[PDB]
Scaffold this active site. Structure first.
Site, PDB file in Angstrom:
ATOM      1  CG  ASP A   1      89.691 103.766  95.801  1.00 45.33           C
ATOM      2  OD1 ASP A   1      90.622 103.942  94.751  1.00 45.33           O
ATOM      3  OD2 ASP A   1      89.468 102.689  96.254  1.00 45.33           O
TER       4      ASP A   1
ATOM      5  CG  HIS B   1      90.708 100.052  99.014  1.00 45.35           C
ATOM      6  ND1 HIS B   1      89.887  98.786  98.861  1.00 45.35           N
ATOM      7  CD2 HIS B   1      90.002 100.925  98.642  1.00 45.35           C
ATOM      8  CE1 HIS B   1      88.617  99.208  98.265  1.00 45.35           C
ATOM      9  NE2 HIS B   1      88.833 100.528  98.141  1.00 45.35           N
TER      10      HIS B   1
ATOM     11  CD  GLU C   1      92.400 101.183  94.797  1.00 45.94           C
ATOM     12  OE1 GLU C   1      92.387  99.876  94.815  1.00 45.94           O
ATOM     13  OE2 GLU C   1      91.501 101.772  94.066  1.00 45.94           O
TER      14      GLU C   1
ATOM     15  CD  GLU D   1      86.192 103.851  93.762  1.00 48.83           C
ATOM     16  OE1 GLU D   1      86.119 103.488  94.825  1.00 48.83           O
ATOM     17  OE2 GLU D   1      86.402 103.071  92.620  1.00 48.83           O
TER      18      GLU D   1
END
Ligand SMILES: *[C@@H]1O[C@H](CO)[C@@H](O)[C@H](O)[C@H]1NC(C)=O
Ligand SMILES: [Co+2]
Ligand SMILES: [Co+2]
EC number: 3.2.1.91
Length: 434
Positions: A214, A228, A212, A217
């Site tokens: 990101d 991640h 993942e 956020e």
């Protein structure tokens, strides 16, 4: 699960720009689809619910296999039920939408066709987008990120899933989420435990893991970026607590890194870079442009543009690390100063590079946090820590902020708007759109 048509499925269109090193950009036409978890799951031959509230039908769903055979996902009324709308290159998601029932946020994927997800190869390229976070208070998260999902939503690997990407199946992320009602063409009723604080969710015996990225956020108070890695790059099912993640007893007993190598300017010391009003470098009451570049070394660079003024990610000094590029040295320095070993145990940026070298699906969502009230993003966390604890303070929000029921009641009109998505080789997305 199969798909039912008691309610039609019309994906809201959404255009984006594909740019080239030559200096031009060309418009692409796609659409967005809402994740299967937000849909109505009922019997294939009737309107009888297979899932209602936060419990499964014991008759239609006695086990995972039987459940998937008897149940289907139906269409979604994007605007009236989910508060999701689009206009040209812009996408808006309302926080709370009241129809026959109450809906909170949504998780959406960008499609290539009405039956397949759009895949992006991030390595060597950059992703740019505009965002308006002005209507996002403490406790909310307007997120834009990428995950290593299959383009067909899992259909080719699991024939018992005939709904596919058209109905938002196949989700996975670095949390190895166990709240998914369907994973790998099977229901997740076995081992299902209703959430103690959410009347609409629960946790099952299975989870869905994958890399993942990101990109974004944030809300009007805080923002964060974080890669991640997972030992298995793509989507992969996991068993119970062996899943790790926020949905298990031990978040570090799995194949994915739930924490990631996060970069929050405020957490790193620059508390004047991002916030509501003229007292901050980036005024969150106004739209802003966010550009993220993935150089082949595996490092990630970031810069912003607002009102024609450009700002590189702010410089940070952590341990022996100094700079504004998210690289191995930064991530290593972060674990040394703030603590933890999850990111490095999972392979760090080298393992993450395997994800960005392959295809990843674009996800855009709006959510509140039923597990930690979003304190990890905009407040002091853990709440018993003080500013004397390295990295504890991530934002100015009160440690009492973000209670789901409270923000849902007080800020139902909150929303996030993502727009003007542009993708292409590093250095190309700032050129004129086609
Ligand atoms: C925060 O970052 C901005 C942009 O790089 C910079 O102009 C400002 O001086 C920084 N302030 C602090 C306290 O780090
Ligand atoms: Co199993
Ligand atoms: Co570099």
């Amino acid at each position: 699960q199969s798909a039912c048509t008691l309610q039609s499925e019309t994906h809201p269109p959404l255009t984006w720009q594909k740019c080239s090193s030559g200096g031009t950009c060309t418009q692409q036409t796609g659409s967005v689809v809402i994740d299967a978890n937000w849909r109505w799951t009922h019997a294939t031959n009737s309107s009888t619910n297979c899932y209602d509230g936060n419990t499964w039908s014991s008759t239609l769903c006695p086990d995972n296999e039987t459940c998937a055979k008897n149940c289907c996902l139906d269409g979604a009324a994007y605007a009236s039920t989910y508060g999701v709308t689009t206009s040209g290159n812009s996408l808006s998601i309302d926080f709370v939408t009241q129809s026959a029932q109450k809906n909170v946020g949504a998780r959406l994927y960008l499609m290539a066709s009405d039956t397949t997800y759009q895949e992006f190869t991030l390595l060597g390229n950059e992703f740019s987008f505009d965002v308006d976070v002005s209507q996002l208070p403490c406790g909310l998260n307007g997120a834009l990120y990428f995950v290593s999902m299959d383009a067909d939503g899992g259909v080719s690997k699991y024939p018992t899933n005939t709904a596919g990407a058209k109905y938002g199946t196949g989700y996975c992320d670095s949390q190895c989420p166990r709240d998914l009602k369907f994973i790998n063409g099977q229901a997740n009723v076995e081992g299902w435990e209703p959430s103690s604080n959410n009347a609409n969710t629960g946790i099952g015996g299975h989870g869905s893991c994958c890399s993942e990225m990101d990109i974004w956020e944030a809300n009007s108070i805080s923002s964060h970026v974080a890669p991640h890695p997972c030992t298995t790059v793509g989507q992969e099912i996991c068993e119970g607590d062996g899943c790790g993640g926020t949905y298990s007893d031990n978040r570090y007993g799995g194949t994915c890194d739930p924490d990631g190598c996060g970069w929050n300017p405020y957490r790193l010391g620059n508390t004047s870079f991002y916030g509501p009003g003229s007292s901050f470098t980036l005024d969150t009451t106004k739209k802003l442009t966010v550009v993220t570049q993935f150089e082949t070394s595996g490092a990630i660079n970031r810069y912003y543009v607002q009102n024609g003024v450009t700002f590189q990610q702010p410089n940070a000094e952590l341990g022996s690390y100094s700079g504004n590029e998210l690289n191995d040295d930064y991530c290593t320095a972060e674990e040394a100063e703030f603590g933890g070993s999850s990111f490095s145990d999972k392979g760090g940026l080298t393992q993450f590079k395997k994800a960005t070298s392959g295809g990843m699906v674009l996800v855009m969502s709006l959510w509140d946090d039923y597990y930690a009230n979003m304190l990890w993003l905009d407040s002091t966390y853990p709440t018993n820590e003080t500013s004397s604890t390295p990295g504890a303070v991530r934002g100015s929000c009160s440690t009492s902020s973000g209670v789901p029921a409270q923000v849902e009641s007080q800020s139902p009109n909150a929303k996030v708007t993502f727009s003007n998505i542009k993708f292409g080789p590093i250095g190309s997305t700032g050129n004129p759109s086609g």
